[PDB]
């Protein structure tokens, strides 16, 4: 294994003519940043590119774009030889031709809009036969280098002339399309796409290798998540990137056919896949074929489910075939399919978080010229409850808007197309703001699972409590070894209790943020919403999701609402089931359960039993010092006048809760706003506003309440015996 041999890996630099190595390997081969390297792949093909450094890149691998990958007839994980190329000199004339299926809709000067800015100030090293991709004018066209004066390879200097005269050449049989789906078309679910890659890469990429080992590979992988999350997308991507044969089975399509045809088509699909192994059979909308057995009333329907189960069992032949399936509702699928030997591996492709949505927005703005005022991060932040498909649609909609208002001119040209103008089309931030108002988000009702953006900085006071939370949650995650030496197993869960509006919810999210661990919030009322009969499967679904997202902190907020509802046969079944789930929850799984209640007087003692929420943390009203910290936190984002004294404000609000102070800021902020409108000034919030707001300010926690809360702080653990 000489140093020149390296393994292909994902790319970070979107540039076509760029490949990356690690500094230690770049020094090993004796190459530097400016150097032009020659890459030799399989099938006796070659590609030339500029080399760069990458600290993240492992020395045994090389990052190259999918364009470079194709020019080499290579895939992820393959081996290629790299050797220095100082022999590259500037070109005299270059001849590139477009590929028919990517240019048949546009007319005009293809060279000025695409090739011009692509090679401008680029000095790209190219090779004869290479296919490169240029995106612009809401389209991506790929050209193939037909010839270069210094053949077979040369750099494109300003002196090099270009000729792109000619009817687009037709697609060669072996030349795979770059319009086809790949991993670079997927974002917002890195972790999941990784899991699938691990499961599938080995048996699909190295089939002979798996047959010799005798260890069992995966056969059934079930992707699930709301509609439009990219389940169908991932299946296609994995097939292309691994180079496996892809046979799609659409649930509805099969169920639209006669009894005999459905049975027949399923058979053929499997037979065809085995014929072209290695292969991936993807069953889209699986629930269409195999819903819960109780809902599958009908003879023809029952036969097809059984037909599928048998075919799945028939995969014991081990004909290098993987079966992937997608369903919106994991509970809808006949449980017979989730049994071992069939779909025995599941991957939850949930809804994207802020970071994810941003990743996605970037995917569908590749080909569009974006104005400077456009801020996708805002859009991402703003489009909560949006799913991949939602984002993909709004981008199309924001583009279509830019066309409409700019169509005034095009119409007179409709007869023909204005390619040169298509580039002049920019998409303003307004075009997104417009599309934002018109958006119909689908996954708002979905339970969100992501890392909270609430940090310790957002919480005033409670310093020692933050400390105790790091010991309970962070230490066992970051320092498992230490716990084993002392021979103690760490506690499973925590219970926040105290007066309303003191930061119980904030603490739950904060500790999750510190551990960069997933967070799931489920408020009392949410648990009382689930239909009575349905309640049983939903509580379980929650803990399942918590396991999927480990390390994860599961937070049961507003527990007092459920307490009031019991003393309710529904509220009883739920909490009793949560208790059951808690016990089944192994502490070793790194799932932390936190509960919060404003009413420790009516909380179910069962929840406080050792092994459950046995860590009783009291969270009181903020003392003088803390109140100042809270006031700063809320006023961080706001323009405050220098005259406003918060140390005094805190001194006057002894007994006020954290939420009360926030409300005071809001009321004082509302006064400043009022004055900004009536009299046209940049608003500032000054002493007079706080004084006026304070005169009407009221306290949410009475003295009587305090006395009671203080008493429970010393006697809450005693509620498991006889009541007080």
């Amino acid at each position: 294994n000489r140093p020149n041999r390296l393994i292909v890996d994902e790319a970070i630099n979107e540039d076509n003519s760029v490949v990356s190595l690690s500094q230690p390997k770049m020094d090993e081969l004796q190459l530097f940043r400016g150097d032009t390297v020659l890459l030799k792949g399989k099938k006796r093909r070659e590609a030339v590119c500029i080399v760069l450094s990458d600290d993240t890149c492992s020395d045994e691998k090389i990052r190259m774009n999918r364009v470079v990958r194709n020019n080499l007839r290579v895939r992820l994980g393959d081996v290629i030889s790299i050797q220095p190329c100082p022999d590259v000199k500037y070109g005299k004339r270059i001849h590139v031709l477009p590929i028919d299926d990517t240019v048949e809709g546009i007319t005009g000067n293809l060279f000025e809009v695409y090739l011009k800015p692509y090679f401008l100030e680029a000095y790209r090293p190219i090779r004869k036969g290479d296919i490169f991709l240029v995106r612009g004018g809401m389209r991506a066209v790929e050209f193939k280098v037909v010839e270069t004066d210094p053949s077979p390879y040369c750099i494109v200097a300003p002196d090099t002339v270009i000729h792109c005269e000619g009817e687009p050449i037709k697609r060669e049989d072996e030349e795979e399309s770059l319009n086809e789906v790949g991993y670079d078309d997927i974002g917002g679910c890195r972790k999941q796409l990784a899991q699938i890659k691990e499961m599938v890469e080995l048996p699909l990429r190295h089939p002979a290798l798996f047959k010799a080992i005798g260890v069992k590979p995966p056969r059934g992988i079930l992707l699930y998540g709301p509609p439009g999350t990219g389940k169908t997308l991932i299946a296609r991507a994995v097939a292309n990137e691994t180079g496996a044969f892809f046979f799609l089975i659409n649930g509805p399509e099969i169920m639209s056919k006669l009894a005999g045809e459905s049975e027949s088509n399923l058979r053929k699909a499997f037979e065809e896949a085995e014929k072209n192994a290695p292969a991936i059979i993807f069953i889209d909308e699986l629930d269409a074929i195999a819903p819960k057995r109780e809902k599958t009333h009908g003879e023809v329907e029952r036969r097809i489910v059984s037909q599928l189960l048998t075919l799945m069992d028939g995969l014991k032949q081990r004909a290098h075939v993987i079966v992937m399936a997608a369903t919106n509702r994991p509970n809808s699928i006949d449980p017979a399919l989730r049994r071992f030997g069939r779909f025995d591996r599941e991957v939850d492709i949930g809804i994207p978080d802020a970071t994810g949505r941003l990743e996605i927005l970037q995917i569908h703005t590749k080909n569009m010229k974006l104005a400077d005022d456009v801020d996708l991060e805002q859009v991402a932040n703003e489009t909560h409850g949006h799913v991949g498909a939602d984002l993909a649609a709004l981008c199309s909609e924001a583009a279509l808007q830019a066309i409409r208002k700019k169509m005034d001119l095009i119409d007179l040209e409709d007869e023909t197309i204005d390619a040169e103008v298509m580039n002049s089309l920019a998409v303003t931030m307004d075009d997104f703001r417009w599309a934002l108002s018109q958006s119909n988000p689908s996954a708002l009702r979905e339970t969100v699972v992501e890392v909270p953006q609430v940090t310790w900085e957002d919480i005033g006071g409670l310093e020692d409590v933050k400390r105790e939370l790091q010991e309970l949650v962070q230490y066992p995650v970051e320092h498992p070894d230490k716990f084993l030496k002392f021979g103690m197993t760490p506690s499973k869960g925590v219970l926040f209790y105290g007066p309303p509006g003191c930061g119980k919810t904030l603490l739950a999210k904060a500790i999750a943020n510190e551990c960069q661990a997933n967070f799931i919030s489920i408020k009392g009322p949410e648990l009382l919403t689930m239909w009575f009969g349905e309640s049983e499967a939903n509580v379980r679904e929650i803990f399942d999701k918590a396991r999927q997202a480990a390390p994860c902190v599961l937070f049961f907020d507003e527990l007092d609402s459920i307490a009031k509802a019991r003393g309710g046969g529904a509220a009883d079944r739920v909490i009793n089931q949560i208790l059951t789930e808690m016990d089944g929850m192994s502490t070793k799984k790194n799932v932390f359960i936190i509960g919060a209640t404003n009413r420790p007087d009516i909380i179910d003692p069962a929840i406080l039993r050792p092994g459950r929420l046995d860590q009783l943390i009291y969270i009181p009203l903020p003392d003088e010092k803390s109140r100042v910290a809270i006031l700063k936190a809320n006023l961080r984002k706001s323009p405050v006048a220098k005259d406003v004294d918060l140390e005094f404000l805190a001194k006057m609000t002894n007994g006020f809760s954290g939420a009360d102070l926030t409300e005071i800021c809001q009321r004082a902020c509302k006064l400043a706003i009022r004055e900004s409108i009536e009299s046209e000034i940049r608003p500032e919030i000054r002493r007079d506003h706080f004084e006026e707001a304070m005169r009407f300010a009221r306290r949410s926690v009475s003295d009587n309440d305090i006395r009671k809360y203080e008493m429970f702080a010393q006697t809450l653990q005693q509620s498991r015996g006889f009541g007080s």
Binding site: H95, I162, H163, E167
Partner: peptide
């Protein structure tokens, strides 16, 4: 069809 005929480079 073949090779060249026209112009480009610019810059």
């Amino acid at each position: 069809f073949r090779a060249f005929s026209g112009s480009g480079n610019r810059l």
